[PDB]
Amino acid sequence: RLGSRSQAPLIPQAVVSKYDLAIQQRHADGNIEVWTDSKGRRYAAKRSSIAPAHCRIMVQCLRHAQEQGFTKFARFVTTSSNAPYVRHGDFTYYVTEWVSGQPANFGLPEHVAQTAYTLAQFHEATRSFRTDWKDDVFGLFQARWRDLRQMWLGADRKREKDAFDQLLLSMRDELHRDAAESLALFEDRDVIAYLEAERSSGGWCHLDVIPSNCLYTPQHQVVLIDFELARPAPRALDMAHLLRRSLERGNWDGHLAYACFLHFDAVRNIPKSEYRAVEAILRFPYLPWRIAHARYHFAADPSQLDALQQYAVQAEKRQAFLASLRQQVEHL
Numbered sequence: 001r002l003g004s005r006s007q008a009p010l011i012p013q014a015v016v017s018k019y020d021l022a023i024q025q026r027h028a029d030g031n032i033e034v035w036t037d038s039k040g041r042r043y044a045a046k047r048s049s050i051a052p053a054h055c056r057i058m059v060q061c062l063r064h065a066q067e068q069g070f071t072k073f074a075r076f077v078t079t080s081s082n083a084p085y086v087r088h089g090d091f092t093y094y095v096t097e098w099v100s101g102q103p104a105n106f107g108l109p110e111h112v113a114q115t116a117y118t119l120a121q122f123h124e125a126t127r128s129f130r131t132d133w134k135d136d137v138f139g140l141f142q143a144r145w146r147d148l149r150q151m152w153l154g155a156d157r158k159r160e161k162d163a164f165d166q167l168l169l170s171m172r173d174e175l176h177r178d179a180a181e182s183l184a185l186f187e188d189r190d191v192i193a194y195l196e197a198e199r200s201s202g203g204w205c206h207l208d209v210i211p212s213n214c215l216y217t218p219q220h221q222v223v224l225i226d227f228e229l230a231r232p233a234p235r236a237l238d239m240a241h242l243l244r245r246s247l248e249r250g251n252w253d254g255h256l257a258y259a260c261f262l263h264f265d266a267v268r269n270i271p272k273s274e275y276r277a278v279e280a281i282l283r284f285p286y287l288p289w290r291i292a293h294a295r296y297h298f299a300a301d302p303s304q305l306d307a308l309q310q311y312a313v314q315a316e317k318r319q320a321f322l323a324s325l326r327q328q329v330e331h332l
């Protein structure tokens with residue numbers, strides 16, 4: 001019994017042997033397995049729980065994007081029978097060529113720029129592709145707000161308040177203001193019109209925009225991997241998710257936001273309503289919600305206090321950034 005100190009299980013050899021890759025060496029590396037041939041050529045093998053039908057549309061989506069010029073993805077390798085996956089032991093395995101690069105550093109404008117460019121290219125290249133294949137962003141955030149309010153009410157009535165409880169209570173008025181401003185933006189007719197128009201025109205988002213899926217290459221581009229969460233969705237979702245992650249880790253340095261907006265805009269103009277949808281998402285106090293949710297619904301962990309402390313440290317810089325962006329959007 002090793003419990004949570006159990007290593008990633010090796011992919012069964014029978015799966016490897018369905019391919020024609022003459023693999024000599026295999027080892028886990030993060031959430032993929034690296035397969036290497038006698039020349040040292042590498043492949044990334046993924047153990048997934050996605051359905052085979054889902055794997056098929058995912059591949060078809062990327063091949064469609066490619067016929068439109070898209071290059072920013074790891075290329076799938078097929079089995080000896082031409083299948084895009086192997087199904088074995090209740091898992092779906094798929095393999096891609098290896099992409100040389102490093103996980104994007106979302107604190108560097110250059111890396112944010114290239115991630116944004118790539119995400120925008122993916123969205124553009126997939127316009128109109130299987131648009132009805134499977135969205136209530138207002139309801140999601142409304143529920144989070146209701147949760148957040150309940151959580152600080154719970155904290156306030158504790159006999160003994162710990163450092164986290166007290167810190168969360170100290171920011172209630174700012175958190176309330178931000179949540180209210182966000183939900184008001186989601187209720188604005190222009191934001192809704194944007195979201196609905198995107199739903200109609202299609203275009204997929206990647207929807208797992210984390211450094212380990214955004215590989216910054218020696219050719220100074222970003223190549224995406226892991227399209228398992230990708231689906232038709234408004235472009236603002238990928239844009240806002242990239243921005244939030246970048247900005248929270250670069251203390252709201254607007255060079256990171258500019259790098260992002262410029263490179264989305266280069267592929268397709270950002271209209272005012274798209275900016276406003278992005279603002280609605282960014283204005284919501286997502287991190288305090290998420291951290292408090294974990295604490296009070298799941299269990300306390302000291303990392304939650306670290307995270308809330310960092311949010312508090314950055315809170316004025318975040319306010320300043322969102323203020324300047326709001327002004328920018330009024331004089332586009």
Ligand SMILES: N[C@@H](Cc1c[nH]c[nH+]1)C(=O)O
Pocket residue numbers: 032044074097098099100101102103215225
């Ligand atoms: N080259 C990536 C790993 C990878 C390539 N393809 C899939 N995963 C890295 O930074 O480690």
